[PDB]
Design a protein around this nucleic acid. Structure first.
Ligand SMILES: [Mg+2]
Ligand SMILES: [Mg+2]
Ligand SMILES: [Mg+2]
Ligand SMILES: [Mg+2]
Ligand SMILES: [Mg+2]
Ligand SMILES: [Mg+2]
Ligand SMILES: [Mg+2]
Ligand SMILES: [Mg+2]
Ligand SMILES: [Mg+2]
Ligand SMILES: [Mg+2]
Ligand SMILES: [Mg+2]
Ligand SMILES: [Mg+2]
Ligand SMILES: [Mg+2]
Ligand SMILES: [Mg+2]
Ligand SMILES: [Mg+2]
Ligand SMILES: [Mg+2]
Ligand SMILES: [Mg+2]
Ligand SMILES: [Mg+2]
Ligand SMILES: [Mg+2]
Ligand SMILES: [Mg+2]
Ligand SMILES: [Mg+2]
Ligand SMILES: [Mg+2]
Ligand SMILES: [Mg+2]
Ligand SMILES: [Mg+2]
Ligand SMILES: [Mg+2]
Ligand SMILES: [Mg+2]
Ligand SMILES: [Mg+2]
Ligand SMILES: [Mg+2]
Ligand SMILES: [Mg+2]
Ligand SMILES: [Mg+2]
Ligand SMILES: [Mg+2]
Ligand SMILES: [Mg+2]
Ligand SMILES: [Mg+2]
Ligand SMILES: [Mg+2]
Ligand SMILES: [Mg+2]
Ligand SMILES: [Mg+2]
Ligand SMILES: [Mg+2]
Ligand SMILES: [Mg+2]
Ligand SMILES: [Mg+2]
Ligand SMILES: [Mg+2]
Ligand SMILES: [Mg+2]
Ligand SMILES: [Mg+2]
Ligand SMILES: [Mg+2]
Ligand SMILES: [Mg+2]
Ligand SMILES: [Mg+2]
Ligand SMILES: [Mg+2]
Ligand SMILES: [Mg+2]
Ligand SMILES: [Mg+2]
Ligand SMILES: [Mg+2]
Ligand SMILES: [Mg+2]
Ligand SMILES: [Mg+2]
Ligand SMILES: [Mg+2]
Ligand SMILES: [Mg+2]
Ligand SMILES: [Mg+2]
Ligand SMILES: [Mg+2]
Ligand SMILES: [Mg+2]
Ligand SMILES: [Mg+2]
Ligand SMILES: [Mg+2]
Ligand SMILES: [Mg+2]
Ligand SMILES: [Mg+2]
Ligand SMILES: [Mg+2]
Ligand SMILES: [Mg+2]
Ligand SMILES: [Mg+2]
Ligand SMILES: [Mg+2]
Ligand SMILES: [Mg+2]
Ligand SMILES: [Mg+2]
Ligand SMILES: [Mg+2]
Ligand SMILES: [Mg+2]
Ligand SMILES: [Mg+2]
Ligand SMILES: [Mg+2]
Ligand SMILES: [Mg+2]
Ligand SMILES: [Mg+2]
Ligand SMILES: [Mg+2]
Ligand SMILES: [Mg+2]
Ligand SMILES: [Mg+2]
Ligand SMILES: [Mg+2]
Ligand SMILES: [Mg+2]
Ligand SMILES: [Mg+2]
Ligand SMILES: [Mg+2]
Ligand SMILES: [Mg+2]
Ligand SMILES: [Mg+2]
Ligand SMILES: [Mg+2]
Ligand SMILES: [Mg+2]
Ligand SMILES: [Mg+2]
Ligand SMILES: [Mg+2]
Ligand SMILES: [Mg+2]
Ligand SMILES: [Mg+2]
Ligand SMILES: [Mg+2]
Ligand SMILES: [Mg+2]
Ligand SMILES: [Mg+2]
Ligand SMILES: [Mg+2]
Ligand SMILES: [Mg+2]
Ligand SMILES: [Mg+2]
Ligand SMILES: [Mg+2]
Ligand SMILES: [Mg+2]
Ligand SMILES: [Zn+2]
Lengths: 50, 70, 206, 87, 119, 126
RNA sequence: AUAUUGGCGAGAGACCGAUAGCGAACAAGUACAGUGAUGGAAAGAUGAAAAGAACUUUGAAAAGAGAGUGAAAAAGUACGUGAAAUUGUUGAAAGGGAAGGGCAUUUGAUCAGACA
RNA sequence: CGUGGAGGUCAGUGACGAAGCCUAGACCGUAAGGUCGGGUCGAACGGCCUCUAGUGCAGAUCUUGGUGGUAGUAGCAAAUAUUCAAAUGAGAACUUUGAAGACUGAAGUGGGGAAAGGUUCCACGUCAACAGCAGUUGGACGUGGGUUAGUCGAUCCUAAGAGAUGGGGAAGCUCCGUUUCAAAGGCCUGAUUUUAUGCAGGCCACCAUCGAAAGGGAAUCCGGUUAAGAUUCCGGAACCUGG
RNA sequence: AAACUUUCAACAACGGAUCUCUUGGUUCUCGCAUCGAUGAAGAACGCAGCGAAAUGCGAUACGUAAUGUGAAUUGCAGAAUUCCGUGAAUCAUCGAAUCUUUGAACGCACAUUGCGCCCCUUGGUAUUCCAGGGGGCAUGCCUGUUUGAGCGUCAUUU
């Protein structure tokens, strides 16, 4: 780390982006069934094997 | 905006596939401006940011709210 | 037949204070450690998995098969039997009930119901209809949702309409004499179906 | 020492990412993927690893092209365009 | 709104090039706006419109080339029918209808006769 | 009784194609019978309900009430009539969802295509 | 003419009914474990309809008490029914190193039948 | 005797409440069990004659789930140490600020990097969970911002070693070989003044390629600047490579 | 006599059996024959006015073209010119396109967004250096085309 390949940075980038709470408006859609984001990740709870 | 006001610098998010050459030209062409030099980096969301410095004749601030932001 | 068995589970053997069924290996997921394969295991293979080469059909000797269909035909006269069988036939002329050959040529349902009425079916016809119930089982959601009695069995010698004309009235069944079926002559193995024979059909019998 | 104080020294990757399947199964020193076989022209798989196959066969993916072949088959592999009509 | 294809195809080559530019300036400027406005769905219809123009520019350039290759051995592979790889290498009807001198003589002399039983 | 071999009485199969029907199919599923009047008027029993139509609720609690269909909520298998609503506790107002098999159509909204449909069922119009 | 636990499209069952049935009826080959090969879950049900509780009051708040909606909140996004282990409260009893049991009767509590 | 499903039948029961569940209330049976009342409930269900089987549990250190006694119990005791006041806040042993008392004692509890993490950085908001007391605080939660180079690294080179190629083995997945029993390739300009580049010499026979962010290696410094970047921005002053 | 323990009951907890549901599974049966160098299966990264996923799609990015339908989409915002119409739609159909970075994967490499060569064209005063745009260069093999090698070898010059 701390001097990465563009491939690793890219991945890290994508992971930042996926790292937000459920967008609350979805909760309102007809038949909506998702209550929360159940794929959330925390840097000190689960490492992301690269 | 501070770079625009204080730095005579336009900041653009810019295509990843594009280099300092292509950024410079496209700013020149899309904006009728002369460019001193161009600095780039990759944001942590995987987007390219261009610190575009205009030459002493131009005033990025005008040029900023002539493209229409502020 | 791959079910229950899609694990690489081992026994842990003894010495671990724990039963000896095989167990799912690895970790990190809560499935792992768990009983495997055993018929008493959650997720196990069942004891003696059912198999398709089970014998489903059964042979009956052709002759005996006749002895039965014959017998069942014989009891379609014998009013007590018919009466005892469901079948509302107190207020019918006589038994066997034989109706004009002209019946076989009826094109139109309404005409057909009218006929059957006249010759005495009415009360049986109403017994279907008054008896539709929602199947009690789990059967109700395996393409067997409703339940109901059996109507009369209209037997003909030639189909000139009569089948299509009755095919939609609740309970009634048609048969060409030449065939004639046990399953229909004695539904549920109780003798005494209410049959209505056309003349032609009644004579072809011999 | 064979236990945890030796786990302390675990900081070097044996596998990074596989370009062909992207799986952190690219053995760096061996230069091949423990999962998919790359750069072997063939994809790695084995009849004793069914779950493995199932995890990777056709239709676990986008099927970008195969998707549409049975439509195309159904309509006899038409070429040209559809015409017109009314209301 | 949104540009319509059937109206695009009457427009000349260099009119569609210019629209595509107009639309691009358009789009560019909306994007400046979108980051002030709390929603900007107008931008949708302009970038679906650029699609349309490009489609049509590519449409007409293709059916141009498609015809000046019409009826000759050898035309760009991506104008050739797709079919299926296998279907592509199957014998042609000609190459399959093919028949030996000796065979055809025989096919002629003794062909499968229509006949019937009764009397 | 079914007689064909390309029709199925399978209840599971039926319930699936109901609930997963595409909008275009839901249009026809969502049909209302014309009013006794309009039926003579057009020689036709029923029609896929369409928005700016006029309708009488002939079943249920809002039985008797009438109005203009203001949207066809195909997503919901439901129809909303502009005039039949729920007043709340915060006195805010909310559409009640009605089922077209429980309306009766009282004035059709006519297009060329609408008339064309009525004619395809071999109907007549005034 | 024969084969077919693959693929596309169909019709079915004396089959399983959410610990069953395919591992997966759900964002399931997911989440998660492992350097890797591989391993691999749990998890369906408010109501016809959100009508998903305006308003008042106590509270820092979460909430509570009212009100209100509903056929029903003894359906309140902990939601159909809502057993058992196990728990709180209330009521009744008994208890000198376990408790529970059998035959029998006293005492308390409780109850059916039959009288005419 | 009892269960799931199947054929027949009683035109069986039922939203005027099916099923289920609860009940030291009633009744039938020696018993498996059966029937009723009341309560709870909300959409289905049973009697009889037959058919059928994934058909009856207390045990298997049985499977999965749930739950206890143990018990408010073992404990929360290494790394010298804390204290007064104010501010804030519903709330302060624990937050902020001031004071004081100490510690690490440059072989650091300082100032930076490599591997590894991947946003933890920084601001604002902020306490349901988490930080085995707490919490107004946080590496937590929400929402944003942030990583600027001709000269710093990579990129080039070669190391152990890896590894295509003409080939040779191997039924074959592939194994061997690396300049090896191979017709292995490219530079300098001349000849063109139909013209763009054929031929004219002379050479040189090196035979892939990957393999070092610590080895080799063209070149940048000081001052200033940010909430968070800086040998990268700004200022000034240089230097290298190519043209 | 309390408390405590125990038993029963009512209400209230805990927990999720049971009953009733089922867009799933299982098994049978019938019909059918269509992946890929015309770049498949698979990967990675992206794309929405407001999306983390699932589904969809590829810088023309929950879609473009065409055809049928004939008025929706809907969680909110939105368009408003789209409703007697070459016309709504997260519609159906699908014959035409777009199809990033990759993959047998093909200029060379690849723990690198690493490094060449050719052609056309544009800019910088440029056949030669730099930059932008487009188009190309894997391997075995077959037929053919052209250029060739060998005293393998025939004839023909004077
Ligand atoms: Mg750790
Ligand atoms: Mg771990
Ligand atoms: Mg200025
Ligand atoms: Mg940079
Ligand atoms: Mg087996
Ligand atoms: Mg034990
Ligand atoms: Mg199982
Ligand atoms: Mg039952
Ligand atoms: Mg029944
Ligand atoms: Mg370990
Ligand atoms: Mg190693
Ligand atoms: Mg290897
Ligand atoms: Mg390869
Ligand atoms: Mg459109
Ligand atoms: Mg071809
Ligand atoms: Mg119709
Ligand atoms: Mg409805
Ligand atoms: Mg099959
Ligand atoms: Mg069948
Ligand atoms: Mg299951
Ligand atoms: Mg079972
Ligand atoms: Mg499971
Ligand atoms: Mg479901
Ligand atoms: Mg989970
Ligand atoms: Mg329910
Ligand atoms: Mg539930
Ligand atoms: Mg519901
Ligand atoms: Mg309350
Ligand atoms: Mg009621
Ligand atoms: Mg109730
Ligand atoms: Mg309830
Ligand atoms: Mg609520
Ligand atoms: Mg409940
Ligand atoms: Mg007592
Ligand atoms: Mg006693
Ligand atoms: Mg029995
Ligand atoms: Mg039984
Ligand atoms: Mg069973
Ligand atoms: Mg009890
Ligand atoms: Mg009694
Ligand atoms: Mg009761
Ligand atoms: Mg009841
Ligand atoms: Mg119900
Ligand atoms: Mg029996
Ligand atoms: Mg059993
Ligand atoms: Mg027992
Ligand atoms: Mg037990
Ligand atoms: Mg026993
Ligand atoms: Mg047990
Ligand atoms: Mg336990
Ligand atoms: Mg305590
Ligand atoms: Mg203690
Ligand atoms: Mg201790
Ligand atoms: Mg201390
Ligand atoms: Mg302290
Ligand atoms: Mg302090
Ligand atoms: Mg000291
Ligand atoms: Mg010292
Ligand atoms: Mg410390
Ligand atoms: Mg640091
Ligand atoms: Mg980290
Ligand atoms: Mg952030
Ligand atoms: Mg911080
Ligand atoms: Mg708290
Ligand atoms: Mg923590
Ligand atoms: Mg704590
Ligand atoms: Mg706390
Ligand atoms: Mg944060
Ligand atoms: Mg350097
Ligand atoms: Mg480089
Ligand atoms: Mg080799
Ligand atoms: Mg190298
Ligand atoms: Mg180096
Ligand atoms: Mg070095
Ligand atoms: Mg400085
Ligand atoms: Mg800055
Ligand atoms: Mg710093
Ligand atoms: Mg400078
Ligand atoms: Mg120089
Ligand atoms: Mg209670
Ligand atoms: Mg059940
Ligand atoms: Mg239901
Ligand atoms: Mg099925
Ligand atoms: Mg069939
Ligand atoms: Mg594959
Ligand atoms: Mg979507
Ligand atoms: Mg939309
Ligand atoms: Mg049209
Ligand atoms: Mg579509
Ligand atoms: Mg494109
Ligand atoms: Mg390659
Ligand atoms: Mg590349
Ligand atoms: Mg190119
Ligand atoms: Mg050749
Ligand atoms: Mg030659
Ligand atoms: Zn791989």
């Amino acid at each position: 780390a701390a001097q990465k390949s563009f491939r690793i940075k890219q991945k890290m980038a994508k992971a930042k982006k996926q790292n937000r709470p459920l967008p609350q408006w979805i909760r309102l859609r007809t038949n909506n069934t998702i209550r929360y984001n159940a794929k959330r990740r925390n840097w000190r709870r689960t490492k992301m094997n690269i | 905006m501070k770079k625009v006001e204080d730095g005579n610098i336009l900041v653009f998010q810019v295509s990843m596939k594009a280099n300092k050459y292509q950024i410079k030209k496209a700013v020149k062409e899309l904006y009728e401006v002369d460019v001193l030099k161009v600095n780039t980096l990759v944001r942590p969301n995987g987007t390219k940011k261009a610190y575009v410095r205009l030459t002493a004749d131009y005033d990025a601030l005008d040029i900023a709210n002539r493209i229409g932001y502020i | 037949e791959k079910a229950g068995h899609q694990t690489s589970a081992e026994s842990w053997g003894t010495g671990r204070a724990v039963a000896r069924i095989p167990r799912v290996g690895g970790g990190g997921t809560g499935r792992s450690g768990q009983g495997a394969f055993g018929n008493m295991c959650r997720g196990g293979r069942m004891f003696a998995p059912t198999k398709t080469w089970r014998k489903w059909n059964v042979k009956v000797n052709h002759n005996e098969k006749r002895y039965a269909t014959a017998s069942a035909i014989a009891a379609t006269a014998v009013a007590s039997l018919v009466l005892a069988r469901g079948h509302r036939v107190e207020k019918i002329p006589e038994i066997p009930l034989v109706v004009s050959t002209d019946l076989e040529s009826i094109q139109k349902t309404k005409e057909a119901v009218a006929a059957l009425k006249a010759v005495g079916a009415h009360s049986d016809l109403l017994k279907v209809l008054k008896s539709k119930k929602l199947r009690a089982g789990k059967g109700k959601y395996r393409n067997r949702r409703w339940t109901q009695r059996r109507g009369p069995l209209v037997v003909y010698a030639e189909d000139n309409g009569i089948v299509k004309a009755l095919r939609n009235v609740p309970g009634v069944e048609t048969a060409n004499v030449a065939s004639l079926n046990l399953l229909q002559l004695a539904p549920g193995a109780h003798l005494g179906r209410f049959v209505i024979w056309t003349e032609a059909a009644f004579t072809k019998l011999d | 020492g064979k236990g945890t104080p030796s786990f302390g020294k675990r900081h070097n990757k044996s596998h990074t990412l596989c370009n062909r399947c992207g799986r952190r199964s690219f053995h760096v020193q061996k230069k091949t993927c423990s999962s998919c076989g790359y750069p072997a022209a063939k994809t790695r798989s084995y009849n004793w690893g069914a779950k493995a196959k199932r995890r990777h066969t056709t239709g676990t993916g986008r099927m970008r092209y195969l998707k549409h072949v049975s439509r195309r088959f159904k309509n006899g592999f038409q070429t040209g365009s559809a015409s017109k009509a009314s209301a | 709104a949104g540009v319509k294809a059937y109206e695009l195809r009457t427009k000349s080559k260099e009119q569609l090039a210019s629209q595509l530019v107009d639309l691009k300036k358009e789009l560019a400027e909306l994007k400046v706006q979108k980051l002030s406005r709390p929603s900007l769905p107008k931008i949708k219809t302009v970038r679906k419109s650029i699609a349309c123009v490009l489609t049509v520019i590519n449409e007409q350039q293709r059916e141009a080339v498609r015809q000046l290759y019409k009826g000759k051995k050898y035309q760009p592979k991506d104008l050739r029918a797709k079919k299926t790889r296998a279907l592509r290498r199957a014998l042609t009807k000609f190459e399959a209808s093919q028949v030996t001198e000796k065979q055809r003589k025989k096919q002629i002399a003794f062909p499968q006769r229509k006949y019937a039983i009764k009397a | 009784a079914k007689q064909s071999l390309d029709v199925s009485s399978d209840r599971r199969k039926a319930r699936k194609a109901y609930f997963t029907a595409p909008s275009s199919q839901r249009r026809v599923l969502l049909s209302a019978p014309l009013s006794k009047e309009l039926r003579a008027q057009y020689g036709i029993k029923a029609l896929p309900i369409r928005r700016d139509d006029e309708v009488l609720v002939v079943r249920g609690s809002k039985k008797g009430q009438e109005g203009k269909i203001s949207s066809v909520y195909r997503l919901k298998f439901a129809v909303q009539v502009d005039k039949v609503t729920k007043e709340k506790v915060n006195g805010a107002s909310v559409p009640i969802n009605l089922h077209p098999s429980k309306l009766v159509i009282t004035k059709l909204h006519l297009d060329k295509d609408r008339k064309a449909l009525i004619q395809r069922k071999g109907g007549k119009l005034e």
